[PDB]
Coordinates of C-alpha atoms and ligand atoms in Angstrom, one line a residue:
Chain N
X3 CA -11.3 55.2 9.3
X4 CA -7.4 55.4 8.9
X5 CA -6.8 53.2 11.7
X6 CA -9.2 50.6 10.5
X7 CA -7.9 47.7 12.2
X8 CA -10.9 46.1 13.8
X9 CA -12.3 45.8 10.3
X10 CA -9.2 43.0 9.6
X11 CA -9.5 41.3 13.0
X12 CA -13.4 41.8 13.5
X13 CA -13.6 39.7 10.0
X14 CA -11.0 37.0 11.2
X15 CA -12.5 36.4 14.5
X16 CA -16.1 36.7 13.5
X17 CA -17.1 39.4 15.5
X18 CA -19.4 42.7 15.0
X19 CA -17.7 46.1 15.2
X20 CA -19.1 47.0 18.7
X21 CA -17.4 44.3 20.4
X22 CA -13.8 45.1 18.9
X23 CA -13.1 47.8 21.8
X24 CA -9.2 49.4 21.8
X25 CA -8.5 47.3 25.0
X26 CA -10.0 43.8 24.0
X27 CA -7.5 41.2 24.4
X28 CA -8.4 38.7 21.3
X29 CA -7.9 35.5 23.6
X30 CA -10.5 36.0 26.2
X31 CA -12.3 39.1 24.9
X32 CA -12.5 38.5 21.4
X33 CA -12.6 35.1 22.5
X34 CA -9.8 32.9 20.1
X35 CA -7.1 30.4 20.7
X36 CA -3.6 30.5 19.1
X37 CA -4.6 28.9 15.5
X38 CA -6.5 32.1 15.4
X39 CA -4.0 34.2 16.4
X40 CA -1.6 33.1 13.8
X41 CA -4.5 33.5 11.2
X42 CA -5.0 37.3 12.1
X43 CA -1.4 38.4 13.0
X44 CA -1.2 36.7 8.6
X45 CA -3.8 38.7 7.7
X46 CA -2.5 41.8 9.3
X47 CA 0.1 42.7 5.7
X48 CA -3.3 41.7 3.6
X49 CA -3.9 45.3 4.2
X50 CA -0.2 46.6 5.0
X51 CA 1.9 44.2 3.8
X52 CA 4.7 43.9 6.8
X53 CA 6.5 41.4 8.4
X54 CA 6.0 41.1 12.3
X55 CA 8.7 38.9 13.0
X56 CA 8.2 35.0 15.0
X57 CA 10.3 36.5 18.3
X58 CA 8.5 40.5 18.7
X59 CA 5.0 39.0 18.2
X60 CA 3.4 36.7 21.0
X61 CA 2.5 39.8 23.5
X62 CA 0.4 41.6 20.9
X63 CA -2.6 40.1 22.7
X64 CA -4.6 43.4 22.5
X65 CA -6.2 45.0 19.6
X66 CA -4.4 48.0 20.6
X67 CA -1.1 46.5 20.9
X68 CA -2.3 45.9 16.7
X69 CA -3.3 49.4 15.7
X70 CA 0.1 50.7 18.0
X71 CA 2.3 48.3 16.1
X72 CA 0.9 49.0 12.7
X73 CA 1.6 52.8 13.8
Chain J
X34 CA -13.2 13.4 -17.3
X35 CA -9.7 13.7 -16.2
X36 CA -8.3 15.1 -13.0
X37 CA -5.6 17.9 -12.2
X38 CA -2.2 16.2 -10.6
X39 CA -2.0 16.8 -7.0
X40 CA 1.6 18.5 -6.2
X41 CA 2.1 15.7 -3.7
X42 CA 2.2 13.0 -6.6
X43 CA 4.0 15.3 -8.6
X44 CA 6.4 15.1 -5.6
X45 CA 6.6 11.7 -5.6
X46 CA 7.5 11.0 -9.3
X47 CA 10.0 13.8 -9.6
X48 CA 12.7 12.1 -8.4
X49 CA 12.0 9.7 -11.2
X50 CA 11.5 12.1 -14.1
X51 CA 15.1 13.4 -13.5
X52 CA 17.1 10.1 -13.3
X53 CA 16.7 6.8 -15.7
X66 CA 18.0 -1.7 -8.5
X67 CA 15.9 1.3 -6.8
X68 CA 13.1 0.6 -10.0
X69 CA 11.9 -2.5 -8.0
X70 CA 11.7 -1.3 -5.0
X71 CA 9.8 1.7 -5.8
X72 CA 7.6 -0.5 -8.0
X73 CA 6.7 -2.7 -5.5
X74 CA 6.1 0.2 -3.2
X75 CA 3.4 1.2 -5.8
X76 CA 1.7 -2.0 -6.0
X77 CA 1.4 -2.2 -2.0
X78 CA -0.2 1.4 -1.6
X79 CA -2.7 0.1 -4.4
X80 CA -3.5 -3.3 -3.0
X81 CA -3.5 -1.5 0.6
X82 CA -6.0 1.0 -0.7
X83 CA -8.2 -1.8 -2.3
X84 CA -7.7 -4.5 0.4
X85 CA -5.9 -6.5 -2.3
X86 CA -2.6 -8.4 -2.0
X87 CA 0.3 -7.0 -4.0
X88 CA 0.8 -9.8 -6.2
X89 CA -2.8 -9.5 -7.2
X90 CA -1.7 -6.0 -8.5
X91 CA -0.6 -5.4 -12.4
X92 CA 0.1 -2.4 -13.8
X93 CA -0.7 -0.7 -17.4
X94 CA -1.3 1.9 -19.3
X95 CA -4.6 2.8 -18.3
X96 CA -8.3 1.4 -17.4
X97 CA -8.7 1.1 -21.2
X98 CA -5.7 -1.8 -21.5
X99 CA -6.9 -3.0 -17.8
X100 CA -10.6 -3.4 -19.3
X101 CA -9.6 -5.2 -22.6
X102 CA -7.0 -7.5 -20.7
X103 CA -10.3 -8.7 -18.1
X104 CA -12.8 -8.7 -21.0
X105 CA -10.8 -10.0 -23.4
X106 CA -8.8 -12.2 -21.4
X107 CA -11.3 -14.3 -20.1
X108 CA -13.6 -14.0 -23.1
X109 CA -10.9 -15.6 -25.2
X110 CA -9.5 -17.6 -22.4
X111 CA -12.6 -19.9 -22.1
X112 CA -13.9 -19.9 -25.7
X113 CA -13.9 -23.4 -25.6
X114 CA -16.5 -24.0 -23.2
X115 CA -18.1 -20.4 -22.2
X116 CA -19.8 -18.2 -25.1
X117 CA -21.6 -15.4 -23.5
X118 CA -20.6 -12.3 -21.7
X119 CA -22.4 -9.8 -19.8
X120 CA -21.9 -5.9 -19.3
X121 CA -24.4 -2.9 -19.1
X122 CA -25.5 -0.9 -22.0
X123 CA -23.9 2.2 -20.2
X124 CA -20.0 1.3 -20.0
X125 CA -17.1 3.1 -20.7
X126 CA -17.2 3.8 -24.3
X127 CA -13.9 1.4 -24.9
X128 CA -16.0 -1.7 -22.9
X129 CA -18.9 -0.8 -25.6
X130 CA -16.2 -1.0 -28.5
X131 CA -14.2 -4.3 -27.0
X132 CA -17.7 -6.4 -26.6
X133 CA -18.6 -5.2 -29.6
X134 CA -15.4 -7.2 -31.5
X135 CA -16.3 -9.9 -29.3
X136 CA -19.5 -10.3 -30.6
X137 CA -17.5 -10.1 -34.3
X138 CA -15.8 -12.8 -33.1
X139 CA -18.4 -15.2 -32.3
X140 CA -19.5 -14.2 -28.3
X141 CA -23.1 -13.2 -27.5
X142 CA -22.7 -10.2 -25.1
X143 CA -26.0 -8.9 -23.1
X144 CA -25.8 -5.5 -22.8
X145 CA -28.2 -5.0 -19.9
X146 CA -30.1 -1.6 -19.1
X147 CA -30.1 0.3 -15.9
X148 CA -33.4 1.5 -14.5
X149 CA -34.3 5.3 -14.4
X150 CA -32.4 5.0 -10.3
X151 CA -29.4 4.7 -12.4
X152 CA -28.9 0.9 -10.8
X153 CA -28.8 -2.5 -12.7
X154 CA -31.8 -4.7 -11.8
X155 CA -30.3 -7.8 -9.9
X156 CA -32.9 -10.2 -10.7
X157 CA -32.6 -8.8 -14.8
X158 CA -28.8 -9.8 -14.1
X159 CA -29.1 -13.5 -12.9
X160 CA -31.9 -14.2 -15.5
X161 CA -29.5 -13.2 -17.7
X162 CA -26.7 -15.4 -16.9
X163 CA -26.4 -18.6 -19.2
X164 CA -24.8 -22.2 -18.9
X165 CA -22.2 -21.0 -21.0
X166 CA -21.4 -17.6 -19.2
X167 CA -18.1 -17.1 -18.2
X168 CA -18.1 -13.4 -17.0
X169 CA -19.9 -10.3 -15.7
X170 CA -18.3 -6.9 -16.1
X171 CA -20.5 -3.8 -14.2
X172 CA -19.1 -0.5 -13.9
X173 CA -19.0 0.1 -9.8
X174 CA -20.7 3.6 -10.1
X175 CA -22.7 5.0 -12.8
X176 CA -20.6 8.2 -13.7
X177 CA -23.8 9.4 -15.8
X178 CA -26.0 10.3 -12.7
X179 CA -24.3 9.4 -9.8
X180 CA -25.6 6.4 -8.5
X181 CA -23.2 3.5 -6.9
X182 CA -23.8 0.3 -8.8
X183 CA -24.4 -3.0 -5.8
X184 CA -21.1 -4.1 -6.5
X185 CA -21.3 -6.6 -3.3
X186 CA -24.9 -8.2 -4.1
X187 CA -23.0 -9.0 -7.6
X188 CA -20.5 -10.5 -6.3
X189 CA -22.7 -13.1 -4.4
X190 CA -24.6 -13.7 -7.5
X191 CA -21.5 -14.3 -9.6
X192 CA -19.8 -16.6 -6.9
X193 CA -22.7 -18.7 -6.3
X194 CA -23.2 -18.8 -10.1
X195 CA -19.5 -19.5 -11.0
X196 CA -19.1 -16.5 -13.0
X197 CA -15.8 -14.3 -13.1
X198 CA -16.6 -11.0 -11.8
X199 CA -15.3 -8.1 -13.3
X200 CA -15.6 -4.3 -12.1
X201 CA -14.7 -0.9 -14.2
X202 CA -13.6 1.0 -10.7
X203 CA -11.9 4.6 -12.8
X204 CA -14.2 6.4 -11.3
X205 CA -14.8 4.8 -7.8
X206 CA -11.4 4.2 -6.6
X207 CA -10.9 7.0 -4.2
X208 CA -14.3 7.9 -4.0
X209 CA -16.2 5.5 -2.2
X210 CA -14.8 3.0 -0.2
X211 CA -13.4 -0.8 -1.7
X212 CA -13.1 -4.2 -0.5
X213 CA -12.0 -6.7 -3.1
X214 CA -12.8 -10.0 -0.8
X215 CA -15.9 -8.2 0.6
X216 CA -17.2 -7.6 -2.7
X217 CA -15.8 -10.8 -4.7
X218 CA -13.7 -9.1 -7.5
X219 CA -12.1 -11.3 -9.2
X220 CA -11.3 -8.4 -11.6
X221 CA -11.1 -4.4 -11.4
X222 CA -9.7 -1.8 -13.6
X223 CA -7.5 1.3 -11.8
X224 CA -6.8 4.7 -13.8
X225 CA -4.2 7.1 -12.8
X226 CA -5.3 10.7 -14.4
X227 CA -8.9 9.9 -12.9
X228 CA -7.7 10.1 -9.1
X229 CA -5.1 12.9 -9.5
X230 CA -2.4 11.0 -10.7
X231 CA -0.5 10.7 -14.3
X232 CA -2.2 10.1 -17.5
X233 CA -0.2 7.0 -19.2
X234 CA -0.5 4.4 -16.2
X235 CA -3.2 2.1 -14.9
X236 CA -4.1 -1.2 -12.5
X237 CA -5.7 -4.2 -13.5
X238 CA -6.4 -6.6 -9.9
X239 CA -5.9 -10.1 -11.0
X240 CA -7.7 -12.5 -7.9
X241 CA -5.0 -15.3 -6.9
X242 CA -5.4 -18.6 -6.0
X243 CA -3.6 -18.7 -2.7
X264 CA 6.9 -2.6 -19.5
X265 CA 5.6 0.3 -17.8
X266 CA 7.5 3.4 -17.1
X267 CA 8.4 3.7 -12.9
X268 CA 7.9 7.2 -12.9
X269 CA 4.1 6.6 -13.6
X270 CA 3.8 3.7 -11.6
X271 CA 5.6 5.5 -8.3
X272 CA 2.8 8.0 -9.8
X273 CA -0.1 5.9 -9.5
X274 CA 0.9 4.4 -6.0
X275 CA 1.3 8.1 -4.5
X276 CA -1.8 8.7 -5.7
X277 CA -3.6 5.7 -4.3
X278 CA -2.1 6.0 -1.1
X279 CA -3.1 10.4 -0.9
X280 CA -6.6 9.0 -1.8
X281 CA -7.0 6.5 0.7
X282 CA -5.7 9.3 3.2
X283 CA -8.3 12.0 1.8
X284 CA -11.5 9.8 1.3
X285 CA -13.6 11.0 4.5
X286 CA -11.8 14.7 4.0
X287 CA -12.7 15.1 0.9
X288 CA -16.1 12.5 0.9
X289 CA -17.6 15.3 3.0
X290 CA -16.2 18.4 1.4
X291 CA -17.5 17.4 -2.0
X292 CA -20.7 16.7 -0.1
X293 CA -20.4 20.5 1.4
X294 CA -20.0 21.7 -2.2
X295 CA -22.5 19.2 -3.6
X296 CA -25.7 20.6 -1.3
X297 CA -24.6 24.2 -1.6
X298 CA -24.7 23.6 -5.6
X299 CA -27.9 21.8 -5.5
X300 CA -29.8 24.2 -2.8
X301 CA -28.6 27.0 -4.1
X302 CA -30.3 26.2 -7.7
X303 CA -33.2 24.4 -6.2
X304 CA -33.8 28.1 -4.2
X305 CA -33.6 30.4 -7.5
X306 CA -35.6 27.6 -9.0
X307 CA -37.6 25.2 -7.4
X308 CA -38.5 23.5 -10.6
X309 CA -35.1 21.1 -11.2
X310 CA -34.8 17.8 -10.0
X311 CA -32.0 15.3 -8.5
X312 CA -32.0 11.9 -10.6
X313 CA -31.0 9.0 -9.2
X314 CA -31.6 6.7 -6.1
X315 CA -30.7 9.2 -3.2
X316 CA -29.5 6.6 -1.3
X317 CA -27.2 5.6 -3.3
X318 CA -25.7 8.6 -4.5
X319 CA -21.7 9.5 -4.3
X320 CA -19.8 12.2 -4.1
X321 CA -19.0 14.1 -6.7
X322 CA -21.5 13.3 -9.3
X323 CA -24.5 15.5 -10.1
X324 CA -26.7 14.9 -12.5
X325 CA -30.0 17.7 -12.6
X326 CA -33.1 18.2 -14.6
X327 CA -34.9 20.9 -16.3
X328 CA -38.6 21.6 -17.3
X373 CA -33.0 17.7 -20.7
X374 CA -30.4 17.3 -17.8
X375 CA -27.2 18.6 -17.2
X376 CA -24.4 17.1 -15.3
X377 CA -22.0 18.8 -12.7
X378 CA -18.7 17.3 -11.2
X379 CA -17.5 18.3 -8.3
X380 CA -14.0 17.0 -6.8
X381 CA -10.4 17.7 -4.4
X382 CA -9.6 21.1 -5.1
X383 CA -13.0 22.7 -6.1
X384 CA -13.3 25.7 -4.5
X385 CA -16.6 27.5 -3.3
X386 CA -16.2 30.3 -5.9
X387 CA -16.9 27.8 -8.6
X388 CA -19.6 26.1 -7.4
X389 CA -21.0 30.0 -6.8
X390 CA -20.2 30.5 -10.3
X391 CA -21.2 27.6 -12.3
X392 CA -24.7 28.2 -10.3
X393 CA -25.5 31.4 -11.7
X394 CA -24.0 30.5 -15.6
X395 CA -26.5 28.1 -15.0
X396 CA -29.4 29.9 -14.0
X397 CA -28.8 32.7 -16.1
X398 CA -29.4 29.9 -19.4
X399 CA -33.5 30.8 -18.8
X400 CA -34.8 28.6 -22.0
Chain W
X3 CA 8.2 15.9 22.4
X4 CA 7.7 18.8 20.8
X5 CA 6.1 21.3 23.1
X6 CA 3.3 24.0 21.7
X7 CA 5.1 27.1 20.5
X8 CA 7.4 24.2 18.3
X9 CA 3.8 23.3 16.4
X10 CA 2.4 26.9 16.6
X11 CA 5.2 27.8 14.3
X12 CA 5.3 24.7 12.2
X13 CA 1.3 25.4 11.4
X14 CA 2.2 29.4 11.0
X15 CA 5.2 27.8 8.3
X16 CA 2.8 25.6 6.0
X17 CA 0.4 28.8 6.3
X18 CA 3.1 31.6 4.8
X19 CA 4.4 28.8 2.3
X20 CA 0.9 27.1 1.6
X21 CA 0.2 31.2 0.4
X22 CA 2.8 30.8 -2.3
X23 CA 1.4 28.8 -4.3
X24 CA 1.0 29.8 -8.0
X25 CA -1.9 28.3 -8.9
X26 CA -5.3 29.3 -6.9
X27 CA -6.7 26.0 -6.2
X28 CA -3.5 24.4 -5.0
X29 CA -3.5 27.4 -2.3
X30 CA -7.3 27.3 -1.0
X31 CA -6.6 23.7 -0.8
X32 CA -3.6 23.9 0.5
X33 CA -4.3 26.7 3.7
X34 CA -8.2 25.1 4.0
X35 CA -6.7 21.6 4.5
X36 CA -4.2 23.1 7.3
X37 CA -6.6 25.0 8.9
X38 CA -8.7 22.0 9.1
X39 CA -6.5 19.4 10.2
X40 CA -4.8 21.7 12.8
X41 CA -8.4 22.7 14.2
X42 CA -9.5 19.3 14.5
X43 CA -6.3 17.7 15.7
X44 CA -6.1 20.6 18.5
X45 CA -6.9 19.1 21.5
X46 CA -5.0 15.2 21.4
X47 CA -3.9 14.0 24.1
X48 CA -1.5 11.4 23.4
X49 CA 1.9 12.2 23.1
X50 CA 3.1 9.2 20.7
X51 CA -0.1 10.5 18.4
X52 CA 0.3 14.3 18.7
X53 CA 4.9 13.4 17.7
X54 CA 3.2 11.6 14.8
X55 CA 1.0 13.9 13.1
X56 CA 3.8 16.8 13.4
X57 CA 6.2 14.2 12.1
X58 CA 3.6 13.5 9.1
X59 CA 3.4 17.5 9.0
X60 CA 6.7 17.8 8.3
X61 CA 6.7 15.6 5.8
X62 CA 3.6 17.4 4.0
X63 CA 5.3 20.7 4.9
X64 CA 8.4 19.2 2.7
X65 CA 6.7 18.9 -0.5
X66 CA 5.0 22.3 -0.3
X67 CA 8.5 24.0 0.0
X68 CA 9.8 22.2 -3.1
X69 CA 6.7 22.4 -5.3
X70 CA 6.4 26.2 -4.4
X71 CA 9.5 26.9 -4.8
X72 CA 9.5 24.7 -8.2
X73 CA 6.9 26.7 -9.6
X74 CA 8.8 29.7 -8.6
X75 CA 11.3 28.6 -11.3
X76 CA 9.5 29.0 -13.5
X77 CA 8.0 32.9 -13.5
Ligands
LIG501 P1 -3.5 26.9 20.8 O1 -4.7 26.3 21.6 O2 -2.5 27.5 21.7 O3 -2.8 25.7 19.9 C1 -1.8 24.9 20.5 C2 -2.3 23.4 20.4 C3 -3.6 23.3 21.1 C4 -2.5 23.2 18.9 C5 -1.3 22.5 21.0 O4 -0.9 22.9 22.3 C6 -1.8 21.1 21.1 O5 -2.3 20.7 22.0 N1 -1.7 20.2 19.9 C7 -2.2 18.8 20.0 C8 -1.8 18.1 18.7 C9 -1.3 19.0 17.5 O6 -1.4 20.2 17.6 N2 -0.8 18.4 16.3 C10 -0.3 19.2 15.2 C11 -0.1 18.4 13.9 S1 -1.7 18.4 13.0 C12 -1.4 17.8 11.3 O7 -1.1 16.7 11.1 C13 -1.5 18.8 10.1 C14 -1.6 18.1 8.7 C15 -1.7 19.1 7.6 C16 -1.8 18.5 6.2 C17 -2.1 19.5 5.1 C18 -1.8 18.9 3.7 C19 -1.5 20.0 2.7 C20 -1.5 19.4 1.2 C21 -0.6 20.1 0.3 C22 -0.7 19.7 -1.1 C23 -1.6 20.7 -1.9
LIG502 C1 -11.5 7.3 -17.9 C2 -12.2 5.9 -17.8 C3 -11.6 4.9 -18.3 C4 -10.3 5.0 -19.1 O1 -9.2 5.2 -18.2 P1 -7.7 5.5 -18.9 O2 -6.6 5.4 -17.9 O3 -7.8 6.9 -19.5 O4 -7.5 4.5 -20.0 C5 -12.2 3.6 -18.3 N1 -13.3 3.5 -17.6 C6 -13.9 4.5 -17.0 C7 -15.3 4.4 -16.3 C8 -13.3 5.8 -17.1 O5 -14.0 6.9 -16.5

């Protein structure tokens, strides 16, 4: 895909492509905590190499908030 | 067999590589975090160059200390090649020295040992862990032979200290040998513990006491992660060849020593900062030598 | 004290400057042995424990910056 977000956080969070939906919150769908959160939201600029600061970060909570943020 | 230097201890020496009071201070700092890690005191600690000087000074010293009345020293035919070489001028100079063999385990035979010792023996030096194979020498049971035999006990720890766990009152030492390079510290700088009754460049000796203390810090972490490594090595050959064997007592092995045989041995080390891509390697450049 | 979001973004600050290390195994080290300690310590309950391991993490996080950025001298 072009959009291929859920390959990043479907690989950090251990889970198969059909449960990474668009509205799947990564705390209690994905199911993670917020040493995992920090891991992914890293891992993010492995593939696009950008800087989501420390303040306009903690409510991207869904995997869509990701893909929106990236776009 | 050396180590690379962990950034920590780099760390701590830095400081001391840029400036040449605070020298005692930070020395005595350095002896605590040994003695600490080997449930020594500090004045029991002395530092030098390496576990080459610290093995000639125990050997030696008492070997020439009590010519006069003891003639016979005993070590094991598989020593650190500088041991082999020091007994060996011993012997030049008059001492009988019984090398003893270690059994196909990899392990001294205790009652070989006290058979051994003489009327006129005045010391015992036994590596505490057979780097060959990776088998921990009974460094405790030694000990109590020594100390109800009235021999000075001596142990060549280089490659235990950090490792597995030490006691020098548990296990009677009256004598061990420390090296810096071989637990992630400094090449240059060593430990000889000297049992009570009751010179040396600071940069390496802050060196060698940073690394002491980051060992005695890392030795479950890192017991079990070189453990993780260790099966993953040894499975993974054992699956693409079910032919090779593990030598040694199994329930004695250590971390970090693997010692396999083909159908001639080779030996694996694995240590802090091995990484699963090299144990993945090393498995395959392995399996790919098909004799 | 030091509430949550204070050790959330210590652990996120060994992380970016564990991943600058120059040398490889200094860096899988450095980020597995974070990861590690932070996941096992996660759920202390003691306050006078939980000040002490961030105050230890500090520390650690200290020397990382300065051997980092040493070996970023030299490039
Ligand atoms: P999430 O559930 O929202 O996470 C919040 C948590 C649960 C973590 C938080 O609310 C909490 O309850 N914390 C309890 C205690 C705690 O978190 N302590 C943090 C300190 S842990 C520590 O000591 C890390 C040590 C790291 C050492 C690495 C060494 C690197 C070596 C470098 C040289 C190569
Ligand atoms: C490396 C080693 C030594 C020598 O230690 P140095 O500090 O290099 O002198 C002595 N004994 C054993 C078992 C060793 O592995």
């Amino acid at each position: 895909i072009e959009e291929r977000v859920k390959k990043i956080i479907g690989e950090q969070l251990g889970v198969k492509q059909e449960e990474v939906t668009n509205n799947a919150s990564f705390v209690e769908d994905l199911g993670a905590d917020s040493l995992d959160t920090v891991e992914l939201v890293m891992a993010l600029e492995e593939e696009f190499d950008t800087e989501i600061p420390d303040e306009e970060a903690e409510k991207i909570t869904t995997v869509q908030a990701a893909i929106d943020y990236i776009n | 067999a050396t180590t690379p230097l962990d950034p920590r201890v780099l760390d701590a020496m830095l400081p001391y590589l840029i400036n040449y009071w605070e020298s005692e201070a930070a020395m005595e700092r350095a002896r605590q975090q040994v003695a600490s890690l080997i449930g020594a005191d500090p004045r029991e600690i002395i530092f030098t160059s390496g576990a080459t000087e610290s093995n000639n000074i125990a050997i030696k010293g008492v070997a020439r200390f009590y010519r006069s009345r003891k003639k016979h020293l005993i070590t094991t035919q598989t020593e650190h090649k500088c041991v082999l070489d020091s007994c060996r001028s011993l012997e030049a100079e008059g001492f009988q020295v019984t090398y003893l063999p270690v059994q196909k385990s990899g392990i001294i035979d205790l009652k070989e040992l006290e058979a051994a010792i003489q009327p006129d023996t005045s010391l015992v030096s036994v590596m505490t862990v057979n780097n060959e194979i990776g088998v921990k020498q009974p460094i405790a049971e030694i000990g109590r032979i020594c100390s109800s035999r009235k021999v000075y006990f001596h142990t060549d720890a280089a490659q235990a200290v950090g490792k597995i766990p030490l006691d020098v009152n548990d296990m009677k030492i009256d004598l061990m040998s420390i090296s810096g390079h071989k637990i992630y510290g400094p090449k240059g700088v060593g430990a000889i513990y000297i049992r009570r009754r009751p010179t040396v460049p600071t940069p390496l000796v802050v060196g060698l006491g940073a690394a002491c203390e980051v060992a005695q810090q890392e030795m479950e972490y890192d017991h079990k992660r070189i453990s993780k490594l260790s099966e993953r090595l040894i499975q993974n050959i054992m699956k693409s060849l079910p032919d090779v064997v593990m030598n040694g007592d199994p329930k004695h092995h250590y971390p970090g020593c693997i010692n396999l045989s083909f159908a001639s041995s080779i030996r694996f080390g694995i240590g802090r900062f091995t990484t699963e891509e090299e144990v993945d390697y090393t498995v395959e450049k392995c399996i790919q030598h098909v004799k | 004290a030091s509430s949550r979001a204070q050790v959330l973004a210590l652990y996120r600050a060994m992380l970016r400057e564990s991943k600058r290390f120059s040398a490889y195994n200094y860096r899988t080290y450095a980020v597995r042995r974070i990861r590690d300690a932070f996941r096992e310590n996660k759920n202390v309950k003691d306050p006078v424990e939980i000040q002490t391991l961030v105050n230890k993490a500090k520390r650690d996080l200290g020397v990382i910056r300065r051997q980092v950025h040493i070996g970023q001298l030299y490039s």
